[PDB]
Design a protein around this nucleic acid. Structure first.
Ligand SMILES: [Zn+2]
Ligand SMILES: [Zn+2]
Ligand SMILES: [Zn+2]
Lengths: 118, 355, 237, 105, 109, 99, 81, 115, 111
RNA sequence: AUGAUGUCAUACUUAUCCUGUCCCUUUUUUUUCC
């Protein structure tokens, strides 16, 4: 199923969690106390790291960023990884940015378990 | 608005306009007490042929197009459209495409009863208007640009094929799937076949060979979306035609097993769903070899984060590693640890199906 | 109670206490139901009376019911008719004893002006004939069929469908030779409302017992260009 | 059933899979729509037992809880030989009651 | 920011009979450019008006503002139009030729 | 509104029971309230309600009064012997045929 | 109108489901021929009526069965129109 | 199949239709070569409908493939796409052409033999 | 002894896999018989071979080694002879032997 | 010795109702990088 449905997934997941009113320590985020890396997908093929960091600083400082562009033509592949300073910031970003429309392209945001350093 | 002003019926010399006036009893149907509803509904059922299609639909369909339709109002209007459809039998032939253009959304909607209604009435309309009418009318939607209508068409087609029996409609399909103008046509053809299998199920066995012939030509095509959707088709077929029919699929296996090693991302997910369903249809020896092969790839993907990746591997594990012809400790050692580490997470629970 | 399990259990308990004590006390109170709110029910009271009469053998109640049939109020006449229907369905084979008693009642219903009495009387005959299957009580079933038959021209779906049911019950209990003799003269009537009704009946027969009908068709004389008589049937030995 | 004439049955060839009824509907015959003297078992069409529908209330559509039987009458007149009695139309009643529900509460 | 039912097509009731189209063009004129205006003719339509702005924005402005206007001792009914059906074919001929004009005109293909 | 059957039952009930116990009366018909029975009886049913067309003199009086005592119909209607409903609609009718 | 054509569809379908039922315009010919054909299948069925004919004539039960099944094709002369 | 309240529009149209004249000589396809015939059909329809319609083409082709095609059914099934009268025409010109190729020894029709 | 309800002709296929039971008109059924775990006998659900307007003079199984089972039933088709007001199609209508065949793969029965 | 049409209400029939349930709606510019 095409990825915008995979944004629908995470947003439904959040709202269901609030719907059952479940406590934060057992909130689905809790399984990643061990990661400051969050995946961005669906970025337009134009955004560079300047704009990405600028916008996503809104919840903290960024330790690292890796934007996978195709090396042969250098051009952005439209998805990236982001290492925030403190897990809580990534929780906030996953909550708030999952589904924002940038240049028409609705970007999807998520946790990352085992970020691979390339 | 007409009902606001008043004028005498004789002065309403356009006796068809008289008909329209009295037809705006529709409002009584829409809003009104239960007795108003019942009396109006009888009125219209029995004066149906007296009224005739043209007026009826020309004054119904605008309603159904209303943005401000609530639920009751809608199901009421579909009730009527159904009853008048049962009276006017042929007279609808000019009005089919209109009827679909409005009903189609009921096919894709989160209400359950709305889906079942819309589906049933398209069946009835397909039975009423003759096949050739349906075909000729809703062909041009196959190619239509906006995917919304392509998708909803494919679903409708599957319904009508259930109504009028596959072997009738099969040649039209064969044409569509091997269309050459643009590939969206082919994609929608293959989608039709998927939805048939999903809907009718085991009523398919006597045609399984013909279907698979229709659809496999997309298994190898260089376009990417057609390959994925084709694999999903094959998987739907199999899950319907459980244990049987494997001699008909035999032609298609190798391309599956070819693509499975060397695909990445999406195509991998699809081809995995297909081979998953195929395995039980196989015979314990052929299948045991095939199995122990696939479980290699399978292992590799438990840790993938992509959602449908996870879901597909769930269902597959169920089938392959739930087969009669496998062994305890193999599973116990190589499958169980990663399975329970990865899949038992609170994010799963909060989802509905994954549960 | 707007639920059905409740009403169900209620009726079953009425049976139980009838067994506990004795039919007469409970039957008298149950009969005192004119209970205007007709369905949602006094109907369930009808079922209750049936179970009463069944559990303590209907010697006892049948005179009480046939008595109540006099009280000139409509819904209670119809109450006794329904209760009869259920009675015979429930007790089954034992009707071979009470059918002689009951008939002159049913006669009285089948010969009166309104559809509710005819529709409910026809249900009774259906069940009764299905219970008496094979016991030799056919003369009275045949007489009840003679009163039932004329309603066959009717319009209100509930009565037309009750009548058709009754007719197929009577088919299994009288034989198809009888129903065929009743159904002949109108297979080819000049009307078309009748020809509709008659061919509907004659199908409902022919579907069942289309084998028995072999030795029953009338003998039909052959014309110039065909041969309509079966001679193999009178090969004399 | 005998009560809503707008209802339809599958009417294909019977099979070997027995039929089951919801706890809600249970206790009755399927056709004569009575509540007594169960004699013989129901059997259903292959399709009407395919798929998720393994073990569903023939009538109510819900969960299978018990077996479905035939009254003595229906088996005496052999109405029990018409194949799947599986009702392949949901019917107006369930729809309308659910809709009025969603409206009210 | 627009509720997508808003349109440059407005539907107006409670119209004084035999008002001057001049008067009316002014009324709706303070709001924006008028692509066109039509009034009913038959006694049923006589007194109702379909008014078409050339811009969705002046459209919404008007519909929200003049709504309930007191003209000639009566309040004016305004509404958004549901242009949900059609009454004629689209004239393949003229469409095709004007598009041929466009294609050869800007040498596209 | 009222249907002729409820109407007749009202006539009989009143002539039996007297004008003073409307509770018993309204208890009789379903979907009818004691207040409504009282109102209907005094408004339409009771025999003293004179049911004919307006004389010229009656319309003179009506018009003159409704000019004298604006909008007070329950004050006027006794003075010309009809109900507030009669006086009201009929004055409306005169006013419309005039304009 | 509606009655005629819905009952017509119901009778045509019920008939194509059960060979030999009738409908309000069944003609003498079809009635009589369905009634023969059933007599024939039933003689071949009841093991005994076969013995009766195979003794009344002097043929043997195989030849008798064969002649019955020969006739079941057009037993009452050729059709009427 | 399931319902007897809706009328089989196959039988209905087969009754009330106006057919062509020579559609009754049975025709098999084994006696025939096809890929000779096709371009005739191609150009013919491309003319009638004034553009190219791959799905209509393949529709006729697949209709033609079984050992015995039904000219009545193919007439009907085309009536939708064509003018309806153009249907009976196009049939009244094909069906004999199949007759020609089928009486031929090679399986090839006569007008395309002269051509 | 009905006309279209099976039971008269009975045939079986030599290697034991399938029995077919046929009426004198319009209906034929096929059941498959398979030994179970305890090697007790087990019977499938019926397949179906209906074909309108067709008498059947005799049905018999054909012997093939463990391939699809075939039953080979004499026949005749009276449908057109019904509509020959002249009386021709009563003659010049000769009976057609027609091998039906089970299809173990697809689980149905094809002529 | 009653036709039909009637936005004419009341009776009346159906052991019909009044709890059943939402599970394959997931649809789009391939895109989770050693
Ligand atoms: Zn029953
Ligand atoms: Zn079934
Ligand atoms: Zn149930």
């Amino acid at each position: 199923m095409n990825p915008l449905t995979k944004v629908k997934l995470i947003n439904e997941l959040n709202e269901r969690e609030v719907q059952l009113g479940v406590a934060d320590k057992v909130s689905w985020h809790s399984e990643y106390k061990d990661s400051a890396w969050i995946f961005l997908g669906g970025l337009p093929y134009e955004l560079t790291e300047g704009d990405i960091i600028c916008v996503f600083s809104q919840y903290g400082e960024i330790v690292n960023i890796n934007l996978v562009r195709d090396k042969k033509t250098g051009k952005s592949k439209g998805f990236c990884f982001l290492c925030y300073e403190d897990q809580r910031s990534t929780i906030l970003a996953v909550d708030n940015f999952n589904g924002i429309k940038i240049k028409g392209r609705t970007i999807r945001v998520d946790h990352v378990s085992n970020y691979r350093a390339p | 608005d007409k009902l606001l002003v008043d004028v005498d019926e004789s002065t309403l010399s356009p006796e068809e306009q008289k008909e329209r006036k009295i037809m705006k009893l529709l409002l009584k149907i829409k809003n009104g007490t239960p007795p108003m509803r019942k009396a109006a509904l009888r009125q219209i059922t029995d004066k149906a042929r007296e009224f005739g299609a043209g007026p009826l639909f020309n004054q119904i369909l605008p309603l159904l197009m209303s943005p401000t339709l609530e639920d009751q109002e809608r199901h009421l209007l579909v009730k009527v459209i159904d009853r008048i459809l049962y009276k006017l039998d042929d007279l609808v032939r000019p009005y089919v495409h209109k009827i679909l253009v409005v009903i189609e959304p009921l096919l894709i909607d989160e209400d359950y009863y709305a889906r079942v209604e819309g589906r049933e009435i398209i069946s009835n309309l397909a039975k009423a208007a003759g096949l050739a009418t349906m075909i000729s009318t809703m062909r041009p939607d196959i190619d239509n640009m906006d995917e919304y209508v392509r998708n909803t068409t494919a679903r409708a087609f599957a319904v009508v094929a259930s109504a009028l029996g596959i072997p009738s409609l099969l040649p039209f399909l064969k044409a569509v799937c091997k269309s050459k103008k643009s590939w969206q046509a082919r994609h929608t053809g293959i989608k039709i076949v998927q939805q048939i299998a999903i809907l009718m199920g085991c009523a398919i066995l006597p045609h399984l060979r013909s279907l698979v012939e229709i659809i496999e030509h997309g298994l190898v095509d260089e376009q990417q979306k057609v390959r994925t959707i084709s694999a999903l088709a094959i998987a739907a077929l199999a899950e319907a035609a459980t244990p049987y029919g494997i001699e008909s699929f035999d032609s298609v296996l190798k391309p599956l097993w070819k693509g499975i090693r060397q695909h990445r991302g999406k195509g991998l997910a699809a081809f995995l769903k297909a081979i998953g369903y195929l395995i039980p249809l196989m015979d314990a020896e052929y299948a045991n070899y095939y199995t122990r092969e696939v479980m290699l790839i399978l292992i590799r993907e438990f840790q993938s984060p992509d959602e449908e990746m996870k879901k597909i591997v769930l269902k597959v594990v169920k089938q392959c590693c739930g087969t009669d012809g496998v062994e305890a400790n193999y599973i116990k050692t190589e499958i169980l640890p990663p399975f329970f580490k990865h899949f038992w997470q609170h994010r799963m629970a909060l989802d509905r199906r994954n549960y | 109670a707007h639920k059905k399990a409740i009403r169900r259990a209620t009726v079953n308990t009425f049976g139980y206490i009838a067994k506990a004590i004795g039919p007469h006390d409970v039957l008298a109170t149950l009969l005192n139901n004119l209970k205007v709110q007709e369905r949602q029910n006094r109907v369930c009271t009808t079922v209750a009376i049936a179970i009463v009469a069944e559990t303590c053998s209907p010697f006892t109640v049948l005179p009480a019911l046939m008595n109540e049939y006099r009280v000139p109020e409509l819904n209670v006449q119809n109450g006794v008719l329904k209760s009869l229907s259920f009675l015979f369905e429930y007790i089954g084979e034992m009707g071979k004893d009470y059918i002689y008693a009951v008939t002159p009642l049913l006669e009285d219903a089948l010969m009166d002006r309104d559809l509710v009495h005819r529709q409910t009387a026809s249900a009774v005959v259906q069940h009764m004939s299905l219970g008496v299957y094979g016991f030799g009580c056919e003369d009275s079933l045949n007489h009840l069929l003679n009163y039932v038959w004329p309603n066959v021209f009717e319009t209100s779906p509930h009565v037309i469908q009750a009548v058709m049911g009754a007719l197929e019950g009577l088919r299994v209990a009288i034989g198809p030779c009888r129903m065929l003799q009743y159904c002949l003269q109108g297979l080819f009537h000049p009307a078309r409302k009748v020809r509709d009704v008659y061919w509907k009946i004659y199908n409902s027969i022919y579907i069942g017992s289309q084998d028995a009908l072999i030795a029953h068709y009338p003998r039909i004389y052959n014309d110039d260009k065909n041969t309509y008589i079966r001679y193999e049937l009178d090969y004399i030995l | 059933a005998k009560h809503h004439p707008d209802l339809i049955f599958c009417r294909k060839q019977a099979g070997v899979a027995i039929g089951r009824l919801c706890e809600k509907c249970d206790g009755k015959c399927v056709i004569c729509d009575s509540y007594v003297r169960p004699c013989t078992l129901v059997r259903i069409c292959d399709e009407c037992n395919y798929g998720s529908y393994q073990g569903r209330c023939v009538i109510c559509g819900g969960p299978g809880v018990s077996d479905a039987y035939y009254c003595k009458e229906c088996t005496i007149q052999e109405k029990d030989r018409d194949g799947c009695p599986k009702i392949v139309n949901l019917g107006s009643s369930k729809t309308d009651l659910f809709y009025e529900r969603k409206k009210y509460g | 920011r627009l509720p997508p039912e808003v349109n440059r097509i407005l539907y107006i009731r409670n119209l004084p009979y035999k008002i001057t189209a001049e008067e009316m063009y002014d009324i709706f004129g303070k709001y924006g450019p008028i692509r066109q205006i039509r009034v009913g003719n038959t006694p049923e339509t006589r007194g109702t008006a379909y008014v078409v702005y050339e811009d969705i924005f002046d459209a919404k402005n008007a519909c929200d503002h003049l709504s309930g206007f007191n003209v000639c001792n009566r309040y004016l009914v305004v509404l958004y139009y549901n242009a949900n059906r059609a009454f004629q074919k689209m004239d393949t001929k003229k469409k095709e030729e004007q598009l041929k004009l466009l294609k050869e005109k800007y040498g596209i293909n | 509104v009222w249907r002729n059957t409820e109407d007749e039952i009202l006539k009989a009930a009143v002539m039996k029971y007297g004008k003073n116990q409307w509770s018993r009366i309204a208890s009789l018909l379903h979907r009818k309230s004691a207040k409504q029975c009282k109102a209907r009886w005094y408004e339409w049913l009771d025999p003293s309600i004179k049911k004919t067309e307006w004389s010229r003199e009656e319309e003179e009086k009506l018009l003159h009064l409704a000019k004298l005592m604006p909008t007070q119909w329950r004050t006027i209607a006794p003075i010309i012997g009809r109900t507030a409903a009669q006086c009201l609609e009929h004055y409306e009718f005169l006013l419309d045929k005039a304009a | 109108m509606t009655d005629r054509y819905t009952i017509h569809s119901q009778l045509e379908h019920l008939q194509s489901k059960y060979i030999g039922t009738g409908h309000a315009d069944t003609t003498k010919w079809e009635w009589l021929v369905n009634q023969h054909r059933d007599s024939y299948c039933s003689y071949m069925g009841h093991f005994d009526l076969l013995n009766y004919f195979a003794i009344a004539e002097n043929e043997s039960k195989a030849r008798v069965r064969f002649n019955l099944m020969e006739k079941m094709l057009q037993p009452c002369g050729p059709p009427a129109d | 199949e399931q319902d007897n309240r809706f009328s089989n529009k196959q039988k209905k149209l087969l009754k009330q239709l106006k057919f062509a004249e020579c559609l009754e000589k049975k025709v098999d396809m084994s006696k025939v070569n096809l890929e000779v015939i096709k371009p005739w059909i191609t150009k013919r329809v491309t003319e009638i409908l004034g553009f190219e319609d791959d799905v209509v083409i393949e529709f006729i082709f697949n209709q033609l493939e079984v050992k015995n095609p039904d000219s009545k059914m193919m007439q009907i099934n085309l009536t939708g796409f064509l003018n309806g009268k153009n249907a009976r025409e196009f049939m009244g010109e094909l069906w004999p052409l199949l007759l020609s190729a089928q009486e031929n020894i090679a399986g090839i029709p006569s007008a395309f033999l002269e051509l | 002894c009905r006309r279209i309800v099976p039971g008269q002709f009975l045939a079986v296929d030599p290697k034991g896999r399938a029995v077919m039971i046929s009426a004198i008109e319009k209906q034929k059924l096929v059941y498959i018989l398979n030994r179970d775990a305890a090697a007790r006998l087990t019977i499938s659900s019926p397949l179906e071979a209906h074909k309108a307007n067709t008498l059947v003079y005799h049905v018999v199984g054909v012997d093939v080694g463990f391939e699809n089972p075939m039953f080979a039933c004499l026949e005749m088709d009276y449908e057109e002879a019904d509509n020959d007001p002249t009386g021709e199609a009563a003659a010049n209508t000769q009976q057609t032997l027609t091998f039906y065949e089970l299809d173990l793969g697809l689980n149905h029965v094809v002529r």
